[PDB]
Amino acid sequence: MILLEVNNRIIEETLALKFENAAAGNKPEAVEVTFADFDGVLYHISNPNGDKTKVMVSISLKFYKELQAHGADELLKRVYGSYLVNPESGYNVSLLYDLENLPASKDSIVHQAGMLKRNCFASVFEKYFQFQEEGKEGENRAVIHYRDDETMYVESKKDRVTVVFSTVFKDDDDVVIGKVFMQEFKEGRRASHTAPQVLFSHREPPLELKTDAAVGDNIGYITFVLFPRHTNASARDNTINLIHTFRDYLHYHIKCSKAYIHTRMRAKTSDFLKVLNRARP
Amino acid sequence: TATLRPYLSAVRATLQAALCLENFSSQVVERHNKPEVEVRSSKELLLQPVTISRNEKEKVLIEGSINSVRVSIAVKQADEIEKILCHKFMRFMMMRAENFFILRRKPVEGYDISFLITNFHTEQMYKHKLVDFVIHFMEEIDKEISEMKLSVNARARIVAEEFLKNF
Amino acid sequence: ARFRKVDVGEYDENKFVDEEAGPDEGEVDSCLRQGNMTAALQAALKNPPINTKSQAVKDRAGSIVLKVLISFKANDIEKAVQSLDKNGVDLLMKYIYKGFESPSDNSSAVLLQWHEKALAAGGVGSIVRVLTARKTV
Amino acid sequence: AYHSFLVEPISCHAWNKDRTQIAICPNNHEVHIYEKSGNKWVQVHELKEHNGQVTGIDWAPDSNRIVTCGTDRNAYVWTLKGRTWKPTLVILRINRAARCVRWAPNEKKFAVGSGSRVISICYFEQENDWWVCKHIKKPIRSTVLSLDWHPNSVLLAAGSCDFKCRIFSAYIKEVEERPAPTPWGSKMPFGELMFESSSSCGWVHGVCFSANGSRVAWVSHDSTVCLADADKKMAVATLASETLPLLAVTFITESSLVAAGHDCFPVLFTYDSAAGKLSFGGRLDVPAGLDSLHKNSVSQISVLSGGKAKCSQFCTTGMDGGMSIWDVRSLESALKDLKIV
Amino acid sequence: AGRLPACVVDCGTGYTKLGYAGNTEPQFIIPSCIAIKEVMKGVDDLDFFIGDEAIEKPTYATKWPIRHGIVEDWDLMERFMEQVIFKYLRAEPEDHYFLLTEPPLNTPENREYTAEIMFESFNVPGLYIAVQAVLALAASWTSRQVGERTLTGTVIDSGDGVTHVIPVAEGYVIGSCIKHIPIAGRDITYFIQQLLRDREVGIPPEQSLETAKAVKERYSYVCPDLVKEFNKYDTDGSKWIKQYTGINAISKKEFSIDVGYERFLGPEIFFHPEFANPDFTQPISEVVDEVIQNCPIDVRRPLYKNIVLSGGSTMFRDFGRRLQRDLKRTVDARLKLSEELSKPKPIDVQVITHHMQRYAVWFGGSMLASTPEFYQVCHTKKDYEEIGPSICRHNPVFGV
Amino acid sequence: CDNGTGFVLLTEPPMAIQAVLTLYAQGLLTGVVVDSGDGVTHICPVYEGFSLPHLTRRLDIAGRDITRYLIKLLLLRGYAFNHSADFETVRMIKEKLCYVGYNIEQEQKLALETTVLVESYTLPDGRIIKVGGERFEAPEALFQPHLINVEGVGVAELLFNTIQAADIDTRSEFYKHIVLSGGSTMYPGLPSRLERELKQLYLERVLKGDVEKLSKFKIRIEDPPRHMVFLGGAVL
Amino acid sequence: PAYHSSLMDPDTKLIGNMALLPIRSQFKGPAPRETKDTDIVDEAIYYFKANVFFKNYEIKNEADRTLIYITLYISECLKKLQKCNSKSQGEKEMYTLGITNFPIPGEPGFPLNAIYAKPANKQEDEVMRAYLQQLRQETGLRLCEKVFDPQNDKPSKWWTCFVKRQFMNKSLSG
Numbered sequence A: 001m002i003l004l005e006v007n008n009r010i011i012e013e014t015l016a017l018k019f020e021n022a023a024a025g026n027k028p029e030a031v032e033v034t035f036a037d038f039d040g041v042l043y044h045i046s047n048p049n050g051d052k053t054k055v056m057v058s059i060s061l062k063f064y065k066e067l068q069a070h071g072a073d074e075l076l077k078r079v080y081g082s083y084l085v086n087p088e089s090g091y092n093v094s095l096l097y098d099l100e101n102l103p104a105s106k107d108s109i110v111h112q113a114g115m116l117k118r119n120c121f122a123s124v125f126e127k128y129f130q131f132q133e134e135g136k137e138g139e140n141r142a143v144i145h146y147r148d149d150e151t152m153y154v155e156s157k158k159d160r161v162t163v164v165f166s167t168v169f170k171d172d173d174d175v176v177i178g179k180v181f182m183q184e185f186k187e188g189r190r191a192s193h194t195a196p197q198v199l200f201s202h203r204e205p206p207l208e209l210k211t212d213a214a215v216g217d218n219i220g221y222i223t224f225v226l227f228p229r230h231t232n233a234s235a236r237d238n239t240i241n242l243i244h245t246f247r248d249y250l251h252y253h254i255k256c257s258k259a260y261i262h263t264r265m266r267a268k269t270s271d272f273l274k275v276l277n278r279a280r281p
Numbered sequence B: 001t002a003t004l005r006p007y008l009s010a011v012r013a014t015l016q017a018a019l020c021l022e023n024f025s026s027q028v029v030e031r032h033n034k035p036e037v038e039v040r041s042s043k044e045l046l047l048q049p050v051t052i053s054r055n056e057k058e059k060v061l062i063e064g065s066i067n068s069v070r071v072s073i074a075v076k077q078a079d080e081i082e083k084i085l086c087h088k089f090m091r092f093m094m095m096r097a098e099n100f101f102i103l104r105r106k107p108v109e110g111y112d113i114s115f116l117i118t119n120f121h122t123e124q125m126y127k128h129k130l131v132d133f134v135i136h137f138m139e140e141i142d143k144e145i146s147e148m149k150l151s152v153n154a155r156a157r158i159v160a161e162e163f164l165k166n167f
Numbered sequence C: 001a002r003f004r005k006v007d008v009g010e011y012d013e014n015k016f017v018d019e020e021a022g023p024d025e026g027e028v029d030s031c032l033r034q035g036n037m038t039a040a041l042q043a044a045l046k047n048p049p050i051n052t053k054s055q056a057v058k059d060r061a062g063s064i065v066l067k068v069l070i071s072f073k074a075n076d077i078e079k080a081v082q083s084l085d086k087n088g089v090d091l092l093m094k095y096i097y098k099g100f101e102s103p104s105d106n107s108s109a110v111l112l113q114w115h116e117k118a119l120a121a122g123g124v125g126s127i128v129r130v131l132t133a134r135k136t137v
Numbered sequence D: 001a002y003h004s005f006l007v008e009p010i011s012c013h014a015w016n017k018d019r020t021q022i023a024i025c026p027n028n029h030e031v032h033i034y035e036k037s038g039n040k041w042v043q044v045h046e047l048k049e050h051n052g053q054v055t056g057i058d059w060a061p062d063s064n065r066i067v068t069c070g071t072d073r074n075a076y077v078w079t080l081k082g083r084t085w086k087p088t089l090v091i092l093r094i095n096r097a098a099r100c101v102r103w104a105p106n107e108k109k110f111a112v113g114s115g116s117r118v119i120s121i122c123y124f125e126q127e128n129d130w131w132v133c134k135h136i137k138k139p140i141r142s143t144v145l146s147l148d149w150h151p152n153s154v155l156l157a158a159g160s161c162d163f164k165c166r167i168f169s170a171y172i173k174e175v176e177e178r179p180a181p182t183p184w185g186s187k188m189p190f191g192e193l194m195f196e197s198s199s200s201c202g203w204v205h206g207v208c209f210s211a212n213g214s215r216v217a218w219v220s221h222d223s224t225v226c227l228a229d230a231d232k233k234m235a236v237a238t239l240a241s242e243t244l245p246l247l248a249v250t251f252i253t254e255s256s257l258v259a260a261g262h263d264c265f266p267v268l269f270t271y272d273s274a275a276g277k278l279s280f281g282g283r284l285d286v287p288a289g290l291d292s293l294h295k296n297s298v299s300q301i302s303v304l305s306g307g308k309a310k311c312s313q314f315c316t317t318g319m320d321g322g323m324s325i326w327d328v329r330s331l332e333s334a335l336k337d338l339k340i341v
Numbered sequence E: 001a002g003r004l005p006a007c008v009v010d011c012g013t014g015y016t017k018l019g020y021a022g023n024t025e026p027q028f029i030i031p032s033c034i035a036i037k038e039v040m041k042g043v044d045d046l047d048f049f050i051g052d053e054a055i056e057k058p059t060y061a062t063k064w065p066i067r068h069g070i071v072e073d074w075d076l077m078e079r080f081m082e083q084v085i086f087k088y089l090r091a092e093p094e095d096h097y098f099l100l101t102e103p104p105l106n107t108p109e110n111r112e113y114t115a116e117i118m119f120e121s122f123n124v125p126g127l128y129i130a131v132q133a134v135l136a137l138a139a140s141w142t143s144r145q146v147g148e149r150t151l152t153g154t155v156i157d158s159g160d161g162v163t164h165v166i167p168v169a170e171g172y173v174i175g176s177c178i179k180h181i182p183i184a185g186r187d188i189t190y191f192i193q194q195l196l197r198d199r200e201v202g203i204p205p206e207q208s209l210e211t212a213k214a215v216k217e218r219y220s221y222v223c224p225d226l227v228k229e230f231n232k233y234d235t236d237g238s239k240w241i242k243q244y245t246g247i248n249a250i251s252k253k254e255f256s257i258d259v260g261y262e263r264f265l266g267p268e269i270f271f272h273p274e275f276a277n278p279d280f281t282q283p284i285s286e287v288v289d290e291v292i293q294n295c296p297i298d299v300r301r302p303l304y305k306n307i308v309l310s311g312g313s314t315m316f317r318d319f320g321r322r323l324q325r326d327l328k329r330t331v332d333a334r335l336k337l338s339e340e341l342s343k344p345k346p347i348d349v350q351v352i353t354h355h356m357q358r359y360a361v362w363f364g365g366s367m368l369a370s371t372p373e374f375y376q377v378c379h380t381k382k383d384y385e386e387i388g389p390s391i392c393r394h395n396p397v398f399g400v
Numbered sequence F: 001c002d003n004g005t006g007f008v009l010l011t012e013p014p015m016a017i018q019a020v021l022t023l024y025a026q027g028l029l030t031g032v033v034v035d036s037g038d039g040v041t042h043i044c045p046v047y048e049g050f051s052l053p054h055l056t057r058r059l060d061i062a063g064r065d066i067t068r069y070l071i072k073l074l075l076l077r078g079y080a081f082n083h084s085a086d087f088e089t090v091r092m093i094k095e096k097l098c099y100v101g102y103n104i105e106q107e108q109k110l111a112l113e114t115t116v117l118v119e120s121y122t123l124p125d126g127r128i129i130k131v132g133g134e135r136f137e138a139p140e141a142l143f144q145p146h147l148i149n150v151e152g153v154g155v156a157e158l159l160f161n162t163i164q165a166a167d168i169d170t171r172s173e174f175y176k177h178i179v180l181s182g183g184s185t186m187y188p189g190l191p192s193r194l195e196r197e198l199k200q201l202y203l204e205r206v207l208k209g210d211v212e213k214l215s216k217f218k219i220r221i222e223d224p225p226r227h228m229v230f231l232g233g234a235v236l
Numbered sequence G: 001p002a003y004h005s006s007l008m009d010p011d012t013k014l015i016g017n018m019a020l021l022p023i024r025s026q027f028k029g030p031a032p033r034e035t036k037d038t039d040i041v042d043e044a045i046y047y048f049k050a051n052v053f054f055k056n057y058e059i060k061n062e063a064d065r066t067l068i069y070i071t072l073y074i075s076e077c078l079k080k081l082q083k084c085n086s087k088s089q090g091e092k093e094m095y096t097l098g099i100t101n102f103p104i105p106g107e108p109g110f111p112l113n114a115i116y117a118k119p120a121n122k123q124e125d126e127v128m129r130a131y132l133q134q135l136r137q138e139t140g141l142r143l144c145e146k147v148f149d150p151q152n153d154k155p156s157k158w159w160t161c162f163v164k165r166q167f168m169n170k171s172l173s174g
């Protein structure tokens, strides 16, 4: 697995199992599940008031207000319609599924539910991909703190939309392994000339932040420049699916890089021990 | 290189002169037996420490004693990525010092990796083969460190391409 | 446990105790300019500071011998080394190791060349005497 | 003639009177005795008493008694009663490991060098029925590595880690008397330091007196071999080697030495009485991964026959568990360039 | 606990249980396998699948890294964790403390190797390596037979590899008294497969094991007596012989067969191994009694009064009953001979069967990793940094 | 017959006196005996001929304690030992591998920086474990009671005070005649550790610090090769 | 463990070290006449399907030896019964199989020779041979009514399925 998936498997398999049972005519089993997603997201699936014919899926995001300020509620309403209900205390969005009244193609809503998190993010991108297209310049850029110490800035310009990430590297060495990775992103167009352009700065914040930017030997700034062919209505969704997984994509690969090195070290260390024990009579 | 063969040659001759050990019961503590180069409690049992340098970065420290020899190696680290790869690798091996019975758990200050070869090792193993192992080890860690570097870079490119080409 | 901090061994009466100027600057410099190397080496390997506690005077001799080894020409090393007697090779071997302790420019490149030649004449035993010495350069 | 007794080290050995049996220490707490039967070796005894590694080992020829010392700080005299060896404990009064031991030629005494920087001369008092001992302390300042008795059973050569070869008087008038004057001195009261080498570096691994006692030779860790001639004011001839340190040495004639060490092979040294100089006589072992017979350091050598005045065969044991028998005669014919004495 | 629940992983010989602490059931239960491709250049190391997706991969070879016997492939395990974390649990590894279960009698070295992967590769903020038996005991506190916490008891863990009889005193396993039994869920399935081959026809060849495993989980149970059972079956075959169906992959058709004696014969091998194993013949009840008898005298009764089950292979109906009875017979019989040889106060044998049994370990692990205690005792990233992996050698006990 | 709290005309427990039978076998009438077995450790000063009930002290730490401590120590390293079940097993490990550290700081460096102390020991069930630093950590209890949570000063400092509370005309005779007795006094290096410990104390609480006057401090701890008590009876 | 005979009596007779148990049968032989509702042949058939799985059997009474013999012989009947096509054809071949001179204790081919005593003389020989044959004809007769599903030409698969198992891994044919 190279790219990270966008949908939550726990949500999908929990709903899928319940629907399969509702349609089969079996009495409903109770459900209580607490789980998470990347970026400090917390989910909760349960039976409101103990009614087993009802399955609620709730997601909690510390930075939800920021997404709300950018059309989050309106977008979620479009996608989930009647399944959207008042949020469960402690969460920002709640989906409710009546096991006694399910749609013909259940497998369809099961997948939209698995995308709850990605759909909470969708609006911020649709708003600016929309500005850019209507040539509406000068619009204030959005600031989304997807993590306690990381930020995402989105700004629309005449012919492009910029998505900047202020990410952090914990292990001081991880900064180096990261510089290597960003370097290949920097030169990416040598592999795909139509792909978005990626800029990278270390310690110094980009111009697109002209705003409480964080200076630090472990802060990394990755700028993605998205063009109309990436932001228009036809590519928009896939673009959002990629761009929103970027930060976790980078760290995921840094860690998998270290895993691959551990195997190299196991092979070499092992080779040595063979040569050493061969020194015995 | 033009300077590797001569370096290793000097290191090898030095290790052969230093790996001349015998079993030595403690002279300071009733019925103990300790690697003299580590405890250093009998000045007369310690040999003169000697160094072999290739340049001002790459070198080896060889400390003899009547029953043991400590060997420290300053590994070649050309850049940053190389510095962290070397540190991770030396650490990886040291965590496994027990299986690598001639390795030291921590390096002498100033070096990247240290060996502690004792009379027990030279009793159970051909000392000329232990000499070979040290030289072999020195050459192989540079190659490994290079492969790791290429490995990281190569995987980094494919990773950037995979993500970018999906837009 | 205040008492376990004083190393009484330090004042032990068994603690073994070891049995307690340099080359002529102008002489070697002459030989060097004067014409040929071999004599310069011999003058440089003369009267080593084996008995002075002064790290300065020892480092003094070291610098001299070193300067000579660098001034040499890669192909004149063997000839010179072979002019030395066993005791000479032994002392040369000691200066070469002291050299390894002060890398600067490519002095090590040349020192490794001398080590190869000194080793050929004195054998591994000359290295053994570098380690064995209780009084050294 | 090489034989493997084990893949581990033979810490030390000792042969009985007619070289019919050999006692070796298999790098542990015991002593195994092997006997020759035809062209094979057969293990016949096992001496398990030491509670630490056996370091020293000697065999008094006539009285047929074996003496052993180990890192457990003890010495045991073994006497053969019937078909088994029985150990009698000797209290050395040392608080550190014993490192070596040798019976005097007269078989009434035995010396033990130890990490207590002392030499323990032991003898038997048939009155109170047991072994006692006097200590030779001064001026030893470190572990005594090797010992060798002078033919008069009074003078003792000793090598220690304080880099010295010394000759002491071991005179024990309780079992012998006034030693006849010797070229090393006329006054030999117990413990008298008769001689001390001058070198200030190199642990002295082996020491050896010549057949007539007028010469003593020692090998040090600084890869040198030395010989002191009492018939020449105790002058010392020195020879620095090009190879690794020797660990064992012995005369094979009054002017020839055979040593062996970390190079894993026996070599020859000759002494020019007139010139008062020593020379390298050459490699005796002529062609794992080694061209030598032993595959690890040789730590002991002993004369099998012909004594030290005209040795015809000698023995070497090493860390490889090997035991080799060398024939001087055969060596001379295989190496026509070999010149003994 | 902080904002996010900890991650709990129980990797078994045949199945791995994954989820977040606090939950009663694992969120994922997948086969303990991984399918790889076989000088790895590029990024080939990432081309692998695990669980169900790794079972029948056309161009990939399936591998089972976890199994009593062979040395462990750390490359395989490390890779395995990558997907467990980023593909299934979807947890930012740096934001969650992790609890992993170790196999019985695991070496301390293996603990350091696990800590190296978790801290060095995944950078977790905390790790806890748990002993299965302790989690099993804890899981049982959920029973109505036992209403008072205790970490002293005999754990019988039967899953897919080998069944273990592990004695625990005040929370610490008496490792020198552990004994295992060459019979488990896989052995039983194989046995039912042989009985079906002898009788039923039509079972798809490449589905032989599959059908057996199914018959085992749906229709098996432990009867109180063989002849009587057999008789019930031959007397009124109508209320005992069942029917089983399946679809044959190559024809996508349904094939049916009669399910019979195998129902009770399969689980019987726990009590009569000689039925399917030529090399082992000791009945489970005797192994248990043998194990307890080897423990300190003064702890024998506590062990007899709290024999706890764990694992999918203990799920057969009446497994606990059968075991308790047979163990009482052996114990009562022995006490008799001693009295008849001259007054040992009767020994109370009690096997606990509870609802959270199938995943006893994971459940125990989930509950423990949901308590404030867990976060205090657990080793942190800073501890690993300042002291090294050796800290993970000892994992403090708690719960009582 | 010598009776023992753990193993077996008749020896008698401190407070024929066993302390005197020990010194007796050494051909001694005066001197301080340090006897450490399986249950308790005593310090019995004997003056010209016979014991002195007074001044004799005791240490609530010995064999059994060291064995117990070794079990806790091996548990902290990941080995699943049971205090009651494996007691005999760990005792054998203790007897084969444990010893007394001369310089603790130095021993910790060897264990922490190298693998020279690491020894393998095969358990009765066939498993192989590894014991290193705990080889010298367990016996250290004898010098630092608190390690096993026992109040006191440690055999060494305890031995010091015993002889200090004695006449000044005997202090020398006693000091130069300290003899060990008991299975728990056979840990390699024990004699050396005591001597170093005693000199330290002496230089601090007697010589107050006058280092130069230390060299003339007559310290000889007799550690004879042989269960001296039994030996004593025998001869007599 | 396995299932043992409970018909042993303080007055049960012996032929070799086997127990000469009574049987309710009309076939000829030295078997005592049986009056009780069930006998040794009935006991063996009731225990068969269970006993046949066991590998180890501890011989307690001489009754167990007779029990074991019948158990092994039942197996023989299944091998032959299996290939039959009617309760009738089955009964026919049960007689034909009952008449075959199988090996007896002491003979090569008879397993368990270390457990069964050999006939001491020519009389014990003939009587033992006669008792074993009688047991066979009778056992074989009863199995038929047990093996063929009330719907003839159908040797129940619930009996046929045991055709390959061997009590104590032994065989009267091997």
Ligand SMILES: Nc1ncnc2c1ncn2[C@@H]1O[C@H](COP(=O)(O)OP(=O)(O)OP(=O)(O)O)[C@@H](O)[C@H]1O
Residues within 6 Å of the ligand: E011, E012, E013, E014, E015, E016, E157, E158, E159, E160, E161, E162, E163, E184, E185, E186, E189, E213, E216, E217, E311, E312, E313, E314, E315, E316, E358, E359
């Ligand atoms: N109801 C059931 N009755 C009998 N067996 C069952 C039942 N349910 C599951 N099993 C069996 O449980 C086994 C798996 O058990 P589980 O996963 O708990 O053990 P494991 O952890 O994988 O193996 P181990 O703990 O020995 O390493 C499989 O053989 C499965 O067929």
Ligand SMILES: Nc1ncnc2c1ncn2[C@@H]1O[C@H](COP(=O)(O)OP(=O)(O)OP(=O)(O)O)[C@@H](O)[C@H]1O
Residues within 6 Å of the ligand: F003, F004, F005, F006, F007, F008, F036, F037, F038, F039, F040, F062, F063, F064, F067, F091, F094, F095, F182, F183, F184, F185, F186, F187
């Ligand atoms: N070589 C040894 N090194 C350390 N401890 C040992 C050694 N041998 C025995 N011990 C321990 O010493 C104790 C036994 O000592 P001894 O044999 O002196 O006891 P005892 O005389 O029976 O009892 P006491 O001496 O307490 O009356 C036990 O703990 C035993 O394990």
Ligand SMILES: COc1ccc(N2C(=O)CS[C@H]2c2cccc(Br)c2)c(OC)c1
Residues within 6 Å of the ligand: E009, E011, E065, E066, E067, E071, E072, E073, E077, E078, E081, E100, E101, E102, E103, E106, E110, E111, E113, E114, E117, E118, E129
């Ligand atoms: C056979 O490969 C294994 C080797 C070791 C272990 N583990 C441990 O030794 C410590 S906890 C467990 C484990 C479980 C999951 C991932 C990792 Br990494 C390690 C393991 O999990 C039982 C499997």
Ligand SMILES: [Ca+2]
Residues within 6 Å of the ligand: E010, E012, E159, E311, E361
């Ligand atoms: Ca399990």
Ligand SMILES: [Ca+2]
Residues within 6 Å of the ligand: F003, F004, F005, F037, F182, F229
């Ligand atoms: Ca006692």
